[PDB]
Ligand binder design. Structure first.
Ligand SMILES: CO/N=C(\C(=O)N[C@@H]1C(=O)N2C(C(=O)O)=C(CSc3nc(=O)c(=O)[nH]n3C)CS[C@H]12)c1csc(N)n1
Ligand code: NI
Length: 336
């Protein structure tokens, strides 16, 4: 495949999250917004062009994908930087650790925001974004439809902490399991382990990944000694009745209950009822690191871009058409 147009920044030689197309012709610099596999797809130890990213993303490139250090160009956040003759700023995307949005200040006075993947927040409206007009927006449209309503991260964490704390205080032999398949959503397991006074147990591979994320005091919070911990991280693929029944056999049968948390259910918060089989309960918690529809709408209506380019769900005519209809509705409502 060749690089799609929505991964190219016009008036520049820049691409964003475009590593799976080989040598992109006329690309002078490759930006990586965050360390999720659809975005880094293609990077390896044999990559020989400059990669611009956050420090955390660079740590993950170095240690997990074995990208050579000479090609990793970490940039600080909230700082005007010049990359191949163009002023850029990286901003926190409120996504996963190391995830950024990129502001490009084009020679002709155009300003472009690329959100990477993000969860829009009103905090962004009082940030550096407020200090200049932004003309073009490359937008994370993951949940650009009104049925995507889910609660705040804080509300979801409140539910998870309360559920776990109650269960473990009632039954000291209970185990909490959190599923994972990528970086992001670390707050779920860290918050639960904090309330329980436990470290989070995990594989060496997961431990290594977390050690790349610049989380303060991380050494006090995580461990590879599983049976010393009340909170385990497992691959998301194991979060099912058979997988958790098998896990219950570990640590000499020390545990007699599992409460597992699986991020899901995007389409009150107390109405989260688990799927239960005997002493295993699986809670499908709607913890998202992407904008809800209303969050996305608010951000775009505040920013008032002249042109929106979706970067997600662009593969079907139906999805493209429906997104463009929402953008038009938003524009007409707000008057821009
Ligand atoms: C709230 O849970 N949301 C989940 C999820 O983790 N679902 C659970 C899961 O894997 N479940 C399974 C089962 O084990 O097959 C089932 C199937 S019912 C069942 N399967 C058995 O194998 C068994 O021995 N007894 N019973 C009764 C119900 S949903 C639950 C989810 C959302 S997306 C995704 N892939 N999973
Ligand atoms: Ni992502």
């Amino acid at each position: 495949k060749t690089c799609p147009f929505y991964k190219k920044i016009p008036g520049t030689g820049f691409t964003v999250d475009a590593f799976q197309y080989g040598v992109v012709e006329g690309c002078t610099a490759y930006f990586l917004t965050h360390f999720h596999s659809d975005h880094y797809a293609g990077l390896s130890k044999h990559f020989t062009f400059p990669v611009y990213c956050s420090e955390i993303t660079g740590n993950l490139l170095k240690n997990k994908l074995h990208v050579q250090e000479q090609y990793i160009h970490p940039l600080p956040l909230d700082t005007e930087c010049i990359v191949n003759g163009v002023k850029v700023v990286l901003l926190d995307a409120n996504h996963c650790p190391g995830a950024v949005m990129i502001l490009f200040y084009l020679p002709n006075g155009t300003v472009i925001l690329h959100t990477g993947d993000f969860r829009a927040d009103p905090s962004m409206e009082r940030s550096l974004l407020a200090d200049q007009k932004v003309h073009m927006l490359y937008l994370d449209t993951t949940y650009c439809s009104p049925e995507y309503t889910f609660p705040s991260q804080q509300e979801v964490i409140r539910f998870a902490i309360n559920t776990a704390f109650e269960a473990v205080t009632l039954n000291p032999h209970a185990l909490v399991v959190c599923g994972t398949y990528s970086i992001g959503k670390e707050k779920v397991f860290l918050a639960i382990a904090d309330v329980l006074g436990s470290k989070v147990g995990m594989s060496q591979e997961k431990y290594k990944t977390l050690q790349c994320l610049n989380i303060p005091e991380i050494n006090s919070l995580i461990t590879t000694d599983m049976c010393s911990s009340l909170v385990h991280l497992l691959p998301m693929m194991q979060i099912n009745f058979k997988g958790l029944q098998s896990h219950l056999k570990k640590c000499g049968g020390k545990y007699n209950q599992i409460l597992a948390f699986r991020p899901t259910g995007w389409t009150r918060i107390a109405d989260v009822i688990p799927q239960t089989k005997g002493n295993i309960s699986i809670y499908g918690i709607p913890y998202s690191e992407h904008s809800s529809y209303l969050e996305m709408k608010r951000f775009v209506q505040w920013l008032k871009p002249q042109k929106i380019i979706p970067t997600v769900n662009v593969g079907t005519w139906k999805s493209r058409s429906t997104m463009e209809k929402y953008f038009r509705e938003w524009k007409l409502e707000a008057g821009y």
